[PDB]
Amino acid sequence: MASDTIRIPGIDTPLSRVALGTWAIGGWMWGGPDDDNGVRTIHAALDEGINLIDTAPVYGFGHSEEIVGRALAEKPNKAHVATKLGLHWVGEDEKNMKVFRDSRPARIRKEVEDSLRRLRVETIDLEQIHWPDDKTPIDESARELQKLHQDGKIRALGVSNFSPEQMDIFREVAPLATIQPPLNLFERTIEKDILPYAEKHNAVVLAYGALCRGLLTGKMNRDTTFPKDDLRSNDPKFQKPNFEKYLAAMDEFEKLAEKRGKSVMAFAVRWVLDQGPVIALWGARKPGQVSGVKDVFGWSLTDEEKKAVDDILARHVPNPIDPTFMA
Numbered sequence: 001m002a003s004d005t006i007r008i009p010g011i012d013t014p015l016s017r018v019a020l021g022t023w024a025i026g027g028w029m030w031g032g033p034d035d036d037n038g039v040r041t042i043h044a045a046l047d048e049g050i051n052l053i054d055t056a057p058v059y060g061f062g063h064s065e066e067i068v069g070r071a072l073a074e075k076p077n078k079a080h081v082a083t084k085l086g087l088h089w090v091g092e093d094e095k096n097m098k099v100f101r102d103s104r105p106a107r108i109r110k111e112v113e114d115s116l117r118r119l120r121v122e123t124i125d126l127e128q129i130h131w132p133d134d135k136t137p138i139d140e141s142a143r144e145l146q147k148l149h150q151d152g153k154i155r156a157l158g159v160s161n162f163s164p165e166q167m168d169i170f171r172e173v174a175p176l177a178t179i180q181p182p183l184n185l186f187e188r189t190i191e192k193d194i195l196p197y198a199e200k201h202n203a204v205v206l207a208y209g210a211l212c213r214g215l216l217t218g219k220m221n222r223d224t225t226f227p228k229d230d231l232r233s234n235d236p237k238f239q240k241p242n243f244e245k246y247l248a249a250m251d252e253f254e255k256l257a258e259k260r261g262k263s264v265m266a267f268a269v270r271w272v273l274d275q276g277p278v279i280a281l282w283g284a285r286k287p288g289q290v291s292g293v294k295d296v297f298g299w300s301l302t303d304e305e306k307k308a309v310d311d312i313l314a315r316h317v318p319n320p321i322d323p324t325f326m327a
Contacts, residue, residue: 004297008204009177010156017273018293019052020045021281026063037286042071044287054281056084065118081119082126085111103133105144112148128158138169146174164197176203183207195276208281210272215246218264249316266295274301
């Protein structure tokens with residue numbers, strides 16, 4: 001029965017193993033009528049049985065959180081909100097905004113107050129350090145967070161983009177409930193350290209980027225290109241000659257998915273779920289983009305499907321050979 005839900009230590013109700021990611025919801029710092037789609041998107045997520053919404057102050061510099069707070073106030077629900085802290089913005093708008101890492105305790109206390117207000121809650125269900133601050137010892141940050149938990153302002157605590165050593169330091173001072181690392185079929189680096197860490201220390205993994213920036217949607221082809229503005233313009237995976245290798249892998253993944261009558265998009269996300277104690281974050285800007293969530297639930301990859309996946313990767317996108325000699 002427990003293949004569609006998982007418990008997060010410190011939160012009573014089980015969470016759906018797909019969570020709504022909100023980087024495309026109020027992702028611009030100035031709002032407007034377009035905020036209505038974001039609200040409708042959250043509402044659609046809730047109706048698909050998603051009860052975890054992941055957001056962050058940095059998304060639209062408060063705006064995403066405001067939309068989540070708004071949406072949750074308009075529709076009866078039992079959603080849980082995970083948010084983040086540790087990124088500091090200075091400036092007026094999108095043009096001159098400066099964003100830096102800041103996990104100083106005073107900034108932490110302020111960010112929690114701000115998130116409580118924007119989300120319209122009295123307690124944050126899950127608070128995550130967005131990035132490790134190189135200028136503040138992890139200890140200082142975890143100490144502040146553990147205190148606010150005791151004040152009853154936060155339920156569970158997590159981190160993102162921490163090394164195992166950084167997580168060990170955090171855990172000496174505060175209980176670690178979750179870890180938010182990047183993971184997808186084409187980007188499995190965290191398998192070597194983060195996943196085993198999560199298993200050994202009983203943390204839940206909130207995986208982001210399950211669709212590898214669109215490559216795994218099944219909607220790209222040999223003709224897909226990106227604007228100078230688009231991050232993918234300078235991403236080797238989306239460039240000659242690599243892009244075709246990835247597209248090639250995609251065609252096989254697609255045939256594999258077809259055998260189950262699943263889309264490649266749903267297959268890619270289900271793969272992510274089946275790597276461990278994992279919740280996959282699912283992004284959406286409009287309510288339509290949430291319909292596919294349904295396809296992820298109610299099944300799991302067989303060991304043969306998992307092997308086929310590895311076979312497909314090895315056949316098309318084999319890991320680069322290290323420059324240094326190796327016996």
